[PDB]
Amino acid sequence: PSQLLQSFTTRTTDYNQLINSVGINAITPQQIQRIEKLSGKAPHHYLSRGVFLAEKSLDKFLDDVEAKKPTFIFIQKYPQKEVALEEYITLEFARYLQDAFNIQVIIQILDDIKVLNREATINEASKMSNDLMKYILAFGFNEDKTFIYTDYQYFGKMYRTISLVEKATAYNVVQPFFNFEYSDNIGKLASPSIMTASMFSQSYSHFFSSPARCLVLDSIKNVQFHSIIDQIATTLNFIQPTVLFHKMVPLLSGVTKFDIPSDHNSILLSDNAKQVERKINKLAFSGGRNTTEEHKKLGGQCDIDVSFQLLNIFSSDNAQVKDVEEKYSKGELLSGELKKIVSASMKDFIVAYDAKKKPITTAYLKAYISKTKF
Amino acid sequence: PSQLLQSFTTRTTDYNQLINSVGINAITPQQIQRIEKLSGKAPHHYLSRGVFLAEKSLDKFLDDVEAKKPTFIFIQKYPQKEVALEEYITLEFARYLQDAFNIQVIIQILDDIKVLNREATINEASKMSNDLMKYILAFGFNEDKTFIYTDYQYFGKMYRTISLVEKATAYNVVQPFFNFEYSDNIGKLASPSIMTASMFSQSYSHFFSSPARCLVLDSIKNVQFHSIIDQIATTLNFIQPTVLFHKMVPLLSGVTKFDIPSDHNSILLSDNAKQVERKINKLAFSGGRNTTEEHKKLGGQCDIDVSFQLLNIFSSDNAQVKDVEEKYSKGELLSGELKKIVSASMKDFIVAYDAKKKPITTAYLKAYISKTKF
């Protein structure tokens, strides 16, 4: 069909019907084991609780990791002023995968694309991108195998193989996934190249000498764009990227609302302990009942309760996630008491992260960039 | 109105009506004097015989040269397998101007754009671009003030200021001057940036520290694209390029035929003495009569005689150009005898050029590139 990231459902989003209509498999539990086997460690909860649910070519990517073949994990990030909670997912999971496999990570910061969407000057874009780098490095990657770049800084090293991707993508193939409006500026129309070319080893000749498989991380939101990228890969003889897709991280409104994360909508990774608490307690949509009697003798709907969903995505112990799931379902926890527990979990989460981020000073980021230079 | 380079006329192309409907002035003789004054030398015949006929902001550009202000001469060249006779004009005239004013020359080779028009691989495009550089250097520029670059090689140094130009040009402003067909590839649509961004000092920070005026050389064929570039200049606060436009160099078919120069259509700068002779003698459209009596008592039409037009563009001495103009007009030269004289003039022309080009070996081009590197 091929539409903008307005792939649709109702009340909640189904996923299995999305997963099938898109034509990609859900992560089989076997795959999750295989990861555990090769990781030599307990699986991440993003896998066990299905934060990451769907898969493109995972089996192939694991065949390669196992074969000691050249491979790399990839993410691309659109720099913004407000950094929403979502952004944590792909970063943290990349860290986990890196540690699990001891494998290169490359992260693209889209400073040019921001400038081209009339959302920042080159300088503005640059200050955001720097700040973003600090957020990324906070996760504590293997910096000897983590390459983080901004487009404006790395473009020349990559342009040849961009231009080949530009050659390979027709405007009409793409002017649906974005609503290109032909009053839109030229550069905006050409962007998709910049975003796709980075998913091929051929863009990173400093790091690879053979073709190397790419494992991209991304929201299921974009499955269709990735299918476009598969067709380009074939028409160029590049390797079709294996891609792992994650569930939507819900806004504080529910769950069914898909606007663009902002201070108004979501928790920001730059938030206070008190600001997070406020957002969970006052803004976070509740799935409980009205009469607290109904709540007891009918239950509570995790389903649409944003405060729970968030707990279910970002918590560490599956033990107390299930305890909550159970008790809230069987009316044993009123929403306020849930929101108390979730406020508590997110406070610790943001406080813990800020602690990791604190030492990533300017001095630090400059040292990393210098190590990274070539 | 804003159409593809299919700006139109009939029998011959008028130019004054083109010049007015486009809204640009014809080069006043005074301007030509002013050049002579500042050149300290006899004017080029490209000016005196009006090979270069129209002007955008010459008066301003001269004001600047005279004020010892930073300025530069610009051309862009589309690399091709067959190098047609036209290509000579802008190169030779750039050389002349450089010598006349002692001023920087920058020449952009459009290797990427070739690759993007499905006309060459990156390697094919590179071999053509090298060969081209050899043709360019043959003209004998002040190599200490002549910067010749290929897009793929220089893009990074220029990308920022490209992206600003991309931001500044709407697809609809441009999808008339080229027939962008939306089955067309993304990169092809974004090309115009690469072609416009190079006409601004901001792209060349290694060479300028203030804004610097740009004098572009180009066929009148493209006047409209340049008017687009004026609007981008304003919406970016860049300097509107002064532009000098040349007459069409006619194909061997006449004069009124505007297809794309090839071995079939025109003389190539790579041609033999004998190949040129053949083309002038057998292929070159004649403007003479049928009955050689009618030729005497009615004349000969320079007008459509390609062999003459060519002589009138590329000859050195205005003396024998006028002698021919006169005698052919008053029936005193039959076409064969004209084509004998023109064959002779072009033989010497191509032989002379080949002599200049011969020493521009690979070794030479590599030395130039090394000098040029930064």
Q: Over chain A, what HEC string results?
A: CCCCCCCCCECECCCHHHHHHHCCEECCHHHHHHHHHHHCCCCCHHHHCCCEEEECCHHHHHHHHHCCCCEEEEEEECCCCCCEHHHHHHHHHHHHHHHHHCCEEEEEECHHHHHHCCCCCHHHHHHHHHHHHHHHHHCCCCHHHEEEEEHHHHHHHHHHHHHHHHHHCEHHHHCCCCCCCCCCEHHHHHHHHHHHHCCCHHHCCCCCCCCCEEEEEEEHHHHHHHHHHHHHHHHHCCCCCEEEEECCCCCCCCCCCCCCCCCCCCCECCCCHHHHHHHHHHHCCCCCCCCHHHHHCCCCCHHHCHHHHHHHHHCCCHHHHHHHHHHHHCCCCCHHHHHHHHHHHHHHHHHHHHHHHCCCCHHHHHHHHHHHCC
For residue B109, the SS3 value is strand
Q: Which two tokens stand for residue A319?
A: 């033990």
Phi then psi for residue A76, to 5 deg, are -120, 140
CA distance to A26, A110, A128, A214, A318, per residue, from A105 (Å): 24, 16, 21, 10, 28
Ranges of each domain in chain B: 1-263, 264-374
Tell which residue, A199, A204, A201, A231, has the closest CA to residue A217.
A199
- Pick from A115, A152, A186: which is nearest to B189 by CB? A186
Return the DSSP state at B4.
S
Tell which residue, B364, B316, B302, has the closest CA to residue B131.
B364
Most B CBs within 10 Å, among A113, A116, A175, A186, to test the B interface: A186
CA distance to A154, B77, B132, B153, per residue, from B150 (Å): 18, 10, 10, 5
Q: What gap in Å lies between CA B321 and CA B108, rounded to an integer?
A: 33
The CATH homologous superfamily to which domain A1-263 belongs is HUPs (3.40.50.620)
Phi then psi for residue A217, to 5 deg, are -115, 140
Q: What gap in Å lies between CA B241 and CA B230, rounded to an integer?
A: 7
Does B112 sit within 8 Å of A159, measured CB to CB? yes
Q: Is A254 left (phi over 0), alpha (psi -120 to 50) or beta?
A: left
How buried is residue B39: exposed, middle or buried, by Cβ count under 10 Å (0-12/13-18/19+)? middle
How many other C-beta atoms can be found within 10 angstroms of the C-beta atom of residue B288?
24
- B182 to chain A: nearest residue by CA? A171
How buried is residue A105: exposed, middle or buried, by Cβ count under 10 Å (0-12/13-18/19+)? buried
- B190 to chain A: nearest residue by CA? A186
How buried is residue A30: exposed, middle or buried, by Cβ count under 10 Å (0-12/13-18/19+)? exposed
- A180 to chain B: nearest residue by CA? B171
Q: What angle do CA B166, B5, B131 make, to 5 degrees?
A: 75
Q: Which two tokens stand for residue B117?
A: 């028009």
Residues with Cβ within 8 Å of residue B290, at least 6 apart in sequence = none
In angstroms and rounded to an integer, the radius of gyration of the C-alpha atoms of chain A is 21
User: Bridge partners of A146?
Assistant: A105
Contact residues, chain A, for B186 at CB < 8 Å: 166, 169-171, 174, 189-190, 192-193
Find the farthest-apart pair of alpha carbons in chain A and give their distance in angstroms, rounded. Answer: 66
Contact residues, chain B, for A188 at CB < 8 Å: 166
- What is the resolution in angstroms? 3.0
How many other C-beta atoms can be found within 10 angstroms of the C-beta atom of residue A102?
10
Residues with Cβ within 8 Å of residue A55, at least 6 apart in sequence = A24, A25, A26, A27, A31, A242, A243, A244, A245
Q: What angle do CA B343, B348, B354 make, to 5 degrees?
A: 125
**Domain B264-374 coded CATH 1.10.240.10:** yes
- How many CA atoms are closer than 13 Å to the CA of A239, on its beta-carbon side? 24
How close, in Å, is residue B132 to chain A by CA atoms?
20
Q: What gap in Å lies between CA A135 and CA A55, rounded to an integer?
A: 27
Residues with Cβ within 8 Å of residue A267, at least 6 apart in sequence = A84, A85, A252, A275, A276, A279, A280, A310, A346, A350
Does A189 sit within 8 Å of B168, measured CB to CB? no
Return the DSSP state at B12.
B
How many other C-beta atoms can be found within 10 angstroms of the C-beta atom of residue B21?
12
Which residue type is seen at A138?
A
Does A163 sit within 8 Å of B185, measured CB to CB? no
